[PDB]
């Protein structure tokens, strides 16, 4: 199975005029990074709706993962589900990004651009989709096997899923945020895996990335304490090989230098009064 190269993009998919666009659509940058990390009860309830819809779009596209299919076709499906449910796909026009989800095969760490790329037997593909509705975002992702995937790669996927769920299950108010990345990295290193450092989880609410950073590796210098009403992603990228990467000329696609495969899972989480609630569930 050869190292991936860029396929060709389908044209911009329309979304109905009546679906509110985030402010950043059609602009070179977003107005984000200084928004409160704790959400009002109103925004939390709305994020339940956005997260539910993202989860559905994820589940739908992931159902179409099969040898023969294009990444572009996964995007079509995710886009349709978001649009049919009244949601704007948050990635569409986010800093110029051209599609409605990210599709990240094999050695693509993250930010892959749905295209003419045809999935083959044994590949793994991450699909990351975000919903914007009622003025808020919800983001979820998962890595899906295509065909007869090698044990090596199944285990990577299952272990990355597990790391993520372990980390989620440590979320509680009064606990150090740094606990997330300690749990993740300790679990990954157990199997000889390497945790991506340069890409992180983030606060999410009325803005896509509100400036809160959630590290997935052990970094006990972070002082941030989790508080009820905080909303953020946990989204570890976990590599079979070394952390060294390249970005393609499209400006988005992140690939492992060594071309070894990598996996990722993600939810949008609420810190409740007593623990956690996963917002990106069906």
Positions at the binding site for a divalent metal cation: 128, 139, 202, 235, 266
Q: Identify the sign of the CA torsion 52, 53, 55, 59.
A: positive
CB 94, CB 232: distance < 8 Å = no
Site string for K ion, 236-265 (x = CB under 5 A): --------------------------x---
Q: Buried b / exposed e across 146-160, counting CB within 10 Å, b at 16+?
A: beebeeebeebbebb
**Least gap, CB of 261 to K ion (angstroms):** 6
Measured from the CB atom, the residue of 164 and 262 that comes closer to K ion is 262
Restricting to residues 170-209, name those near K ion by CB under 5 A.
Answer: none
Measured from the CB atom, the residue of 194 and 262 that comes closer to K ion is 262
**Residue 269 belongs to what H/E stretch?**
strand 267-271
**Least gap, CB of 183 to K ion (angstroms):** 22
**Least gap, CB of 126 to K ion (angstroms):** 5
Does the protein bind K ion through residue 104 (CB under 5 A)?
A: yes
- Burial group, residue 29, by CB count within 10 angstroms (0-12, 13-18, 19+): exposed
Measured from the CB atom, the residue of 15 and 108 that comes closer to K ion is 108
Measured from the CB atom, the residue of 128 and 218 that comes closer to K ion is 128
Pairing of β 124-133 and β 194-195:
unpaired
**Least gap, CB of 262 to K ion (angstroms):** 5
**Least gap, CB of 192 to K ion (angstroms):** 18
Measured from the CB atom, the residue of 108 and 149 that comes closer to K ion is 108
| Whole-number Å distance between alpha carbons of 27 and 6 | 25
**Least gap, CB of 264 to K ion (angstroms):** 7
Restricting to residues 212-241, name those near K ion by CB under 5 A.
Answer: none
Q: What Å distances lie between residue 39 and 21, 42, 43, CA to CA?
A: 21, 8, 6
Measured from the CB atom, the residue of 143 and 231 that comes closer to K ion is 143
| Whole-number Å distance between alpha carbons of 271 and 196 | 24
Binding site listing for substrate: 111, 209
| Whole-number Å distance between alpha carbons of 223 and 230 | 15
| Whole-number Å distance between alpha carbons of 13 and 11 | 6
**Least gap, CB of 241 to K ion (angstroms):** 12
Total residues in contact with K ion, by rule CB under 5 A: 4
Q: Torsions phi, psi of 19, nearest 5?
A: -90, 115
Which residue's Cβ lies closest to K ion? Answer: 104
Restricting to residues 115-144, name those near K ion by CB under 5 A.
Answer: 126
Region binding K ion by CB under 5 A among candidate stretches 25-33, 105-113, 149-157, 158-166: 105-113
User: For 229, left (φ over 0), alpha (ψ -120 to 50), or beta?
Assistant: left
Measured from the CB atom, the residue of 37 and 248 that comes closer to K ion is 248
Q: By the criterion CB under 5 A, which residues form the site for K ion?
A: 104, 108, 126, 262
């Amino acid at each position: 199975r050869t190292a991936l190269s860029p396929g060709v993009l389908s044209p911009t998919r329309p979304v109905p005029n009546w679906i509110a666009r985030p402010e950043y659509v059609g602009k070179p940058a977003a107005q984000e990074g200084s928004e409160p990390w704790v959400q009002t009860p109103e925004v939390i309830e709305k994020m339940r709706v956005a997260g539910r819809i993202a989860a559905g779009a994820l589940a739908e596209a992931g159902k179409a993962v099969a040898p023969g299919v294009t990444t572009d076709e996964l995007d079509r499906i995710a886009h349709e589900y978001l649009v049919d449910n009244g949601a704007y796909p948050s990635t569409l026009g986010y800093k110029g990004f051209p599609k409605s989800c990210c599709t990240s095969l094999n050695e693509v760490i993250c930010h892959g651009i749905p295209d003419s790329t045809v999935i083959t037997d044994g590949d793994i593909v991450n699909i990351d989709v975000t919903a914007y509705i009622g003025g808020v975002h919800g983001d979820t992702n998962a890595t899906f096997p295509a065909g007869d995937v090698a044990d090596e790669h199944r285990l990577l996927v299952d272990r990355t899923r597990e790391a993520t769920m372990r980390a989620i299950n440590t979320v509680k108010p009064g606990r150090a945020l740094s606990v997330i990345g300690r749990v993740i990295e300790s679990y990954a290193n157990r199997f000889g895996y390497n945790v991506v450092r340069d890409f992180t989880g983030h606060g999410i609410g009325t803005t896509f990335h509100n400036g809160l950073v959630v590290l997935h590796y052990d970094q006990p210098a972070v002082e941030t304490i989790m508080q009820p009403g905080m909303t953020f992603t946990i989204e570890p990228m976990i590599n079979l090989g070394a952390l060294d990467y390249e970005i393609w000329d499209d400006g988005w696609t992140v690939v492992t230098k060594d071309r070894k495969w990598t996996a990722q899972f993600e939810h949008t989480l609420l810190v409740t009064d007593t623990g956690v609630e996963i917002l990106t569930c069906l």
